[model samples]
Target chain A: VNFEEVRELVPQKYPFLFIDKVIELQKEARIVCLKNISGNEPFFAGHFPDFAIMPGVLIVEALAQASGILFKKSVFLLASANVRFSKPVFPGDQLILEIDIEKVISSAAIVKGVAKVGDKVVTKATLSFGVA
Target chain B: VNFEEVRELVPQKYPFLFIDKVIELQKEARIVCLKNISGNEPFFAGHFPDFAIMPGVLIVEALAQASGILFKKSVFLLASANVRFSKPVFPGDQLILEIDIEKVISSAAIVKGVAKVGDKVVTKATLSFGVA
Candidate 1:
């Protein structure tokens, strides 16, 4: 799937859509995508003057948004997330996000996502969702 | 504590600021706040075209922003979020958010927040954060 397919699958549009590109999707377990954080991000102007750190919530968001493509619905986030922000995601980092499906239920889906900038893990989240 | 002071504590400004008012903050355990969901909210425009449900992530974002005020410097969100969308939040419903700190460490703090409309629960989240 590419950006257009990703857009058709997910409900979000420009400025809000975090998933920029889709690389692969293995229905049972994985979905890999990309989100390039640019210097033009609107949030940077107020997030901090000198130090720009992407809001951790948005990391979880990028993961959940990718999961929406996995489940093929507007996924509602729920979780026992063992998430850690080991490193800050800067404006120019091309975040490669990977989500692994841990379980599937009649009413929900559980996914563990890892976001990395090249080789270093920046944010990790395990989120569950019930369709909206 | 009020809205202005709340703004002083968290970096997210208008067009993004979630917490509208701070009613109370007890250092050891809790914070009571407000987030008035408006019809003009930017996200609502693209979130859905036929039906609008406040994006679950924004609800979580609102809660995290409230927790940021509770923790006092920019709070980095981490969580085991047990958030549910029991009832859909509408354009004018005032969201009352309450965050209870379950644990606090030298560099991390854990919090659980519940958001309500009038007397009904809209969403709940348990978030943890590490200072950036």
Candidate 2:
């Protein structure tokens, strides 16, 4: 999906909208997207003035935002587990986000995915959400 | 923890900084903090021009950020979740974040927490992180 298409599918907007490009998508199955980290990201200034490290929470934000675009109406995130971050993401890092649905129970759905910088895995997680 | 003390513990700064006040702290155990959601938050402008609901991802961020302060050098956020939000936070919502360490493994840790609005849980989750 192009930038506009991804935006139309989900409600998030700029700055907060973390998904940059959709490389692949499968109906009701999974998705692949990318976020190009930039030196201009406002958070970098504060995360560390001396050493600009990406806050882990924002990394999770990138992951959850990708899926939030994929799963729009799953209004409430119920849980997330087994997430591991193997590397640090910097301004020039190109984050590759991959996600897949694990289970759907009524208004709740479970998903698993990972974030990577090339072959190096940066983050991975399982998330559950409840639809409003 | 006061704002200054909280800042001393973590590297996050204004805007990106989600935790507003640390009301409680137990050295290696738990922490309870607060974040006052604002309609002025930059994301709200694009999130919805008409309806300024706090993004679910940021709700998760508040929770993760709370623990992030507690788990300073864990460095990277590996996974987050069991995060569930029951209500949409708005500009005036006062978010209360509560976090506790579930376990800590070599260079990795697990945490559980929730974000609340007037005693109603707006978000809840379990997060795991790996230190660099």
Candidate 3:
């Protein structure tokens, strides 16, 4: 899915919407998406003036957003646990967001998400979401 | 510490700087800060256009930023784990960011942070930081 199609599927809008496009997705199973980071991002300006490092929390946000895309609907991010940022993401880095559903029930689901720059895993998390 | 003082103590700034002011501070001990969520916040515009629910990860960022102020110097956010978002924060909400040092060493420190709206805890996390 392109940006527009991803927008149609996901409720989040620009700037705050971290996923640029969906490369692969399977409902209730798994998803793979992309986010092309650029220095022009508004967050970069204030995240640090001298050095532009993508905020680690934002990386977790990206993973959560990717999970929302896998849901194929609007879902409230309920909680995040066991989240870890192993490497810092930069402006030119292209994040490949991959998420897999670990468990699912009627109202909510648990998923494991990983954000990577090529082969290096920059961030990972266990996220819970309430389906809307 | 006012916003300017917070800016001086913490490296984050402007829209990315979630802390508004420091109400209490103790070196190598604890800190209590504030973040008045306003309607005009840039992230609010894109986080959700119709319903302005503050992103959970940003809540974690606010906690991390609060922890930075506790350090009273620039520190690299290493990782976040065991984070839980219990309540949704809104535009009009005032977050009382409170952080306490769990353990400290020569090169790094671990802190426990909690963000509250009135008497309810909105978010909490265990964050690790590398001192510079």
Candidate 4:
């Protein structure tokens, strides 16, 4: 799905919608999407002068935002996550995200996700989200 | 500094360089940076079809990358972090990251960071890293 359609499904608007486009979706197991990082982004101005880096926590938010789409509800609130950073993602690099549901209960779900630039995995995590 | 110059200071290269540019730096307390997310990013393809989210783990990695810049050494590795995702960051939204060192011990340091879309705080975290 494209951003226009996605806007109707999720409450997030421009500057906040993390997913640029949705490439694939399944009823039960997986999801894939993209985030385009730009050089003029506001956060870069203050994060560093000699070097700029994306914050790892937002990566998790990306995963969670995808999960929100997977569940078809905004109920997904991050309860916990375990992450490992294998590499760094840059401004021109498009972040490809992959997520799978490991477990789903009545009010909570467990998901596994990864972020990559190309073939390299930049980060991976097992996250728990709860409906609140 | 651009990624090329940063490569000289750190060991990371393309597909792994999370920081796109370093806009500002301080001797002890602060660092500002950026990570450009893209649609071609590998993680997006599998993250979901109907919806794709960036992933929170990588956001932390971005913070770590910026922290690595602040330290001016590859010695920094993530030890711990407390994060809150205020919004989702999409492809093309230049993630603006701002970081400040709260404490630094012999081999460990504590950093406080925030990710933003325009003026909105998308995520905030307290992170600790150790020299490995």
Candidate 5:
């Protein structure tokens, strides 16, 4: 999907918008898009002066935000998440975020996500979101 | 504590080093220092084009990294965290991170942290970390 369409599907505005673009979407499989990460970010300034690494939790956020779009919700509040950070994300690394809906009960949904930088899986998480 | 002293107390380096400086240290009460955010960062380019909002997870990371220093551990693996994002932190905002260690087991520690941009709390989390 294009940027404007993504803007419509999600409530996140500029700066807070983590999803760069949506590469794929399938309502049946419960899967969604991707976000491309580059080094020219504002947080990198104080996050590190010598070397820049993407914080692990933001990786989960990227996945969570994408899941928010899949559900067409305004605010996807995180209930719980099991995350593992295997590698670091540098500037120019394109993160491929994949999320699969495990289950949905009433107003909450559980999803499992993996972020890959090139061929290596940089981070993975199982996240639960409550519609708000 | 100075950045070099903080480096010696903490195991994080380069990009992974989330805590910029330790402004205050109390061994008994469990409190720590701060991180200054700037707009001239690499992640800003992709995180947003017009406005740059610091990711909520990174705010938690700054707190976690400081907690890691308070405990003097090589790795502070996150066990669980209950986080709330009350406001958005811009690049120039200075985050005053305060962490209180509630309990410590043989290999695990529980900490409560709050990140404030001036008087308002931008994010808060109760985090559990396992020594690894």
Candidate 6:
């Protein structure tokens, strides 16, 4: 799925939309997405002066946005997150976002996501969500 | 302290610089910061189509930025975070960010932060930092 299809599936738009495309999807189990980090991204200009790096929280957001697309029927509100930044993401890096559905109840769900830049893990997160 | 001083203390800059000013600071204890949410913020345009609300992770970043200023002598890298979003933050809202130092050691420190929009708490986080 391209940006247009991802946009129709996801609620976030423009600068807030972290996912660029969906490369793989396996119904209720897992999904893989991509985000192209650009030098011109608005956050890059302000995240740092000489050294530009993606904020760790934004990395978590990208994972959360991916989970949202996985469960498109229900809007999921992030309940809690345990995230770790393994390496810094630079402007030219292309993020490979992968999410696995861990558990799903009537009221809540859990997902684990890992963000990598060509095999180097940049961030990993286990996110809990309240289904709306 | 104003944005200029905050800019000096914190590494983040415009668009990504979540904290607007420092209202209170007690060394090794606590800090209170402010961020005036403007409608023109780039994220608002894409977070939603017609309804504009601040992104939840950005709220966490604001708290992280405040924590950075509180421990300006040493460069602290965010290690992990347990953050909960209590309510939605929107444009034109004034975010009052309060951070309290919970624990400190030679290698790591922990801080608890709460983001409020007036009397209501919007987000609260327990952040772990590694001294770099």
lDDT, residue A69, candidate 2: 69
**Model 5 collision count:** 9
What is the C-alpha RMSD, rounded to one decimal, of candidate 3?
1.7
lDDT by residue for model 1 over A36-86, one digit each (tens)?
A: 898787766655655676766678778888887877632454433445666
What candidate 6 gets wrong by more than 4 Å, as runs, is none
Off by over 4 Å in 1: A73-82, B73-87
Which candidate's TM-score is highest?
3
Going through the candidates in order, state the TM-score of chain A alone for each one.
Answer: 0.89, 0.87, 0.93, 0.90, 0.91, 0.95
- TM-score winner between 3 and 5, please give it: 3
Model 6 over residues B102-127: C-alpha lDDT tens digits?
99888988999999999799998999
Model 3 residue B3 distance off true place after TM-score fit, in angstroms: 1.2
Task: Name every residue pair that clashes in candidate 6.
Answer: none
Model 6 lDDT, full chain set: 0.88
The DockQ-based CAPRI class assigned to model 3 is: medium
The worst-scoring run of ten residues by lDDT in candidate 2 chain B lies at B73-82
Give the C-alpha miss distance for residue B57 in model 6, angstroms.
Answer: 0.3
Segments of candidate 5 deviating more than 4 angstroms? A1-24, A32-55, A68-132
Sorted into a CAPRI-style docking class, model 5 comes out as: incorrect
What's the CA error at residue A58 for candidate 5, in Å? 3.7
What are the TM-scores, per candidate, against the unseen true structure?
A: 0.87, 0.80, 0.95, 0.56, 0.65, 0.94
- Higher-ranked by DockQ: 1 or 4: 1
Worst window of 10 by summed lDDT in candidate 3 chain A: A72-81
A1-132 per-residue lDDT for model 6 (tens digits): 898999899888878889999989988889899999998988888888778888888899999999988887336778888888778888889999999999988888899999999998888888989865
Clashing pairs in 5: A39-A91, A39-B42, A40-B42, A40-B43, A41-B41, A41-B42, A41-B43, A41-B44, A42-B44
lDDT of 4 by residue, B2-73 (tens): 878776654454444567888788868798887788887655554344466665556766777788788883
- Per-candidate clashes, comma-separated: 1, 13, 0, 73, 9, 0
Q: State the lDDT at A63 in candidate 5.
A: 89
Instruction: Return the interface RMSD of model 2.
Output: 3.3
| Model 3 chain B: lowest-lDDT 10 consecutive positions | B72-81
Weakest ten-residue segment in model 4 chain A by summed lDDT = A41-50
